[PDB]
């Protein structure tokens, strides 16, 4: 990602 | 090219200990949040939780929470899940998975066979009679699973591996072939029975009777 | 734990039709967020799972415009238009709104085609088997379909109903047949009493029975 990490940081 | 190869079957007996690997390939590792989930005949799936791949901790669903250990090895992108004290019903085919919005990439799966039960090895029989079909009967072994191929994986088509069936006899399944009826028994037909639990496996040659 | 339920059970389409495949969750799967992580996946037999549609109704790349999915809050569906032959496997519903993350019990889409008549070959007991003391007499029935398909044994005429072990494939991915394999299974000193092994198969695409047999 672009994100992700469980839902953003 | 973005890949996640999960490492081989194993077979254990209750109380030992298992490690199974997960290498990912083709992105930066440390970027996606990685799952691990167990697949079985009778539950179908379930997460069992998931490792943040950047900051290294680990998320464990509670039926997880105890003998399970989610860790990573950065440099070799890979992840690992242990699982300590094992038992039977951790028999199942295990994956990892990398998330970001979505399982966009799964990994290979890795099948967990957890038995106390007495391994034994596979009986191998051979199933002579345009096109002929032949086969193998394998019975008698203990526990699944038996892999089987024909001409070691290069006759693939026209292939009917039937699933097995344990019963009194354990183990039973059968293995058919069809091939052009002008080229056997000139061009050789042979099925191999692999049975990884007694580190076995089994060549027959299909001859006409 | 978000409960995801699924229907149908098992989904038999023509090539061609529409394939509606529901799920229902226990409770709200939209996320704090106000997304809804809802996704279906596809696993076909030996095979790793495949991510199909994601936040309910985006497909995902290389997927084909057949699929799309709708739905919101605890009832989804995902609809495949003009199904095809490799369509086939079972579906599963998926939330990741939730912990722990949840998946449906999966629906199995069975794809309806053309009737075909079974292959049928029959085998008689190896050396080897006898060797050891039994015999087993196997006969394949390949490539038919419909799936439903009645075999009945016979030794020297009479109807045999010990001993037979069952055995059936998933449909196949490419003609979307099934193939069965039949296996009767004696000991040798039975085997050895007896002349005639016949296998025969009751199917739709014959009027009378598909009759195979091996004499000893």
């Known amino acids: 990602x672009x994100g992700x990490x469980x839902x953003x940081x | 090219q973005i890949q996640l190869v999960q490492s081989g079957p194993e077979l254990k007996t209750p109380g030992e200990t298992v490690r199974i690997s997960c290498k990912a390939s083709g992105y930066t590792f440390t970027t996606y949040g990685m799952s691990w989930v167990k697949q079985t005949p009778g539950k179908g799936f379930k997460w069992m939780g998931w490792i943040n791949t950047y900051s290294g901790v680990p998320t464990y669903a509670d039926d997880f929470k105890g003998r399970f250990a989610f860790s990573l090895e950065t440099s070799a992108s890979t992840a690992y899940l242990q699982i300590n004290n094992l038992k039977n019903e951790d028999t199942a085919t295990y994956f990892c998975?990398?998330?970001?919005?979505?399982?966009?990439?799964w990994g290979t799966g890795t099948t967990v066979t957890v038995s106390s039960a007495k391994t034994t090895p596979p009986s191998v029989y051979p199933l002579a009679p345009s096109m002929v079909t032949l086969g193998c009967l394998v019975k008698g072994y203990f526990p699944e699973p038996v892999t089987v191929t024909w001409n070691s994986g290069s006759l693939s088509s026209g292939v009917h591996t039937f699933p097995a069936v344990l019963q009194s006899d354990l183990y039973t399944l059968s293995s058919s072939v069809t091939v052009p009826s002008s080229t056997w028994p000139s061009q050789t037909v042979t099925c191999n029975v692999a049975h990884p639990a007694s580190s076995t496996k089994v060549d027959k040659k299909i001859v006409p009777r | 734990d978000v409960l995801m339920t699924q229907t149908p059970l098992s989904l038999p389409v023509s090539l061609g039709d529409q394939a509606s495949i529901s799920c229902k969750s226990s409770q709200s799967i939209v996320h704090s967020s106000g997304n809804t992580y809802f996704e279906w996946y596809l696993q076909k037999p030996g095979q790793s799972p495949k991510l199909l549609i994601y936040?309910?109704?985006n497909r995902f790349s290389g997927v084909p415009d057949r699929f799309s999915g709708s739905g919101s809050g605890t009832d989804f569906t995902l609809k495949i238009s003009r199904v095809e032959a490799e369509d086939l496997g079972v579906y599963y519903c998926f939330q990741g709104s939730h912990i722990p993350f949840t998946f449906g019990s999966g629906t199995k889409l069975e794809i309806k085609r053309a009737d075909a008549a079974p292959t049928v070959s029959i085998f008689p007991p190896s050396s080897e088997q006898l060797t050891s003391g039994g015999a087993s007499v196997v006969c394949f029935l390949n490539n038919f379909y419909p799936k439903d398909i009645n075999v009945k044994w016979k030794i020297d005429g009479s109807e045999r109903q010990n001993g037979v072990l069952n055995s059936w494939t998933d449909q196949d991915s490419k003609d979307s047949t099934y193939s069965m394999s039949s296996t009767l299974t004696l000991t040798k000193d039975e085997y050895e009493r007896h002349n005639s092994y016949t296998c025969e198969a009751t199917h739709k695409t014959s009027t009378s029975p598909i009759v195979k047999s091996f004499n000893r």
């Open positions: 936040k309910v109704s």
């Open positions: 998975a990398r998330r970001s919005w979505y399982f966009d990439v």
